[model samples]
Target: HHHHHHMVHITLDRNTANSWLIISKDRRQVRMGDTHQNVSDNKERFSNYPMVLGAQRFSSGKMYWEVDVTQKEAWDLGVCRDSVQRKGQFSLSPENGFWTIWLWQDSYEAGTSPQTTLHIQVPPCQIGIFVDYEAGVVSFYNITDHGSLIYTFSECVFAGPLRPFFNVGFNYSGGNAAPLKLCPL
Candidate 1:
């Protein structure tokens, strides 16, 4: 047996973004808006959730990507199913079509059934995400330490295509001012 890794490019999908979230012109980076913007409303827009999707979707194969989270006080990043609810606050778990990880106030948690809280001492400046659709595994890596394992969601059953997910977390006094940028490597 052998291991194969494939690098994938992802960009932020504005249509599915929260009104309070700002997507860069190139759409490869996203950050929490300083204040809510007067943007037109749509069904795909996330109203209560401060999240966005990647323009590209993946149905199968081994896919890998990374995000630059330097200076961010709080954030969330992972992969979610294409059909995930786009309206209100929901559990970020596989059952709800969301498989993610959270970082806030120097704390880390994996969006699993029981929400595994991590005790990582070093904050990850850049995070690497790896997903194997056929293997049913989603892994997170702290690239700051030579790609150390941060967390992994295993035994996932993908019902359909999956898209990259990103969030700067809820609004606060400059809590999410730092953008969560997609690293094109």
Candidate 2:
């Protein structure tokens, strides 16, 4: 199966973004804003975390998207079920409807039950995410390493729609202010 054929366009769904986060007009970038806007509880808006989701949702077949995380120090990338908790505090994990890997303070970690640390010779500048709903698998790749495998979540049982997930952690004293960009197809 050719992956290029499965490459799908993705955009940040403003409705699902945390109140304190900023979304670009094109809906391809997200970052922590200075002040929280007085946005209504859109019902789907993320409450405690500065997280967002892609507009497109998948329920069958395979889908792929590339993200440019160049120079980003704190960010989370992955997929979550449509019914994943959006209120209050919650950790990123499959049991909570999230299957993700993150780069925080130059260290990489998978969003597993215990959070697995990933060691790589080179930090990834771009990441590629692929999911096969029918196959029940979600995988991440380090594009800087020529699509080398970074992590994968297998044996998943998706019960509803799945959306691409992103978490822009605290802008640690300007060190993590760079926006997370969704690369063009």
Candidate 3:
């Protein structure tokens, strides 16, 4: 497999985040907000979804980014097509324009049709995402332990630009309160 090791800079884009999601001033950290901010609603904003998109989008070439999700009990991280629906509740499957892996309770799973259960003996505190657009692959690595392969989405056909996506889950200020931070190289 062709993997790119270079880190790509990416940060949370507030416009795409839900109102209850708090984005750090630097735009590199996302956490469930304790209070909701009175923000105007937009079609781009996730009305019913608990997620955020990166400020930048990728159309070609290889890119990599890492998220520091240590102690985050529930969350979702990966890539989503720019055209993905954000107005309502929907399945976070590849067919729905979302290719992500999530952590719930103590279990890990990938967003596939039937859902791929990931047997990660050690929970990943930091996740490294590598996207080879032309190669049609998106691989996730557990960076906490010198980088171990977590899962990879193969044969991905991008109809449009793909953007970094994150979800802190529905239980804001509760179990999933920990922030999902974007790490610097």
Candidate 4:
């Protein structure tokens, strides 16, 4: 498989503002779009997966990609999707597909009831993806899984080869909403 590396750097300082990295399979048809921040209790949750970032063909098999969210965590950062693009999509809910990685925090309240939480422990790790169309599951793992958290995304769109946008965003929020920075591979 063809392998390459891209980097994205940004800064966030709000509970509302956001940042993102977007790309399309054909640079036109989005395949694997990941929005860094914008997640809320709002139904859709945001469709932040199955994004098409670059010009690639669907192998009809498996694929992988990685994102370096050095600052985005459950408390500091999160992901969401564009409500307009939630139709004909797959997610835990039909309204909108939004999967979040809740950073395990101690001060953060667990809420009144048992919600979702991810206990991840790593020294500045990144986010890893295992797009397994063969198994119909887009699995998410910590860049440093030795003592990190793990999340699974079963609802994935079969668009084709995974193309990455590589830090293709310009801050989502108004101020201090995380910036986009890329690294040299």
Q: Give the lDDT ranking, best first.
A: 2, 3, 1, 4
Candidates 1 and 4 compared by lDDT, better number: 1
**TM-score for all predictions?**
0.93, 0.95, 0.95, 0.41
- Please write out the lDDT profile of model 4 over residues 1-185, one tens digit for every residue: 12223222222222112223232222221111244533353333223432222223234555555555554322222232233243244433212323333333332211112344544455334555454556655445565554233656555543443322222222333322332222223
lDDT of 3 at 14: 94
lDDT of 4: 0.35
Which candidate, 3 or 4, would have the higher lDDT against the true structure? 3
Cα-based lDDT at residue 48, candidate 2: 84
Each model's lDDT comes to 0.85, 0.88, 0.87, 0.35
lDDT of 1 by residue, 36-83 (tens): 777889998878878889988998889888899998888889999999
- Segments of candidate 2 deviating more than 4 angstroms: none
**Where is model 4 more than 4 Å wrong at Cα?**
1-59, 73-115, 145-149, 154-177, 180-185
Best candidate, lDDT? 2
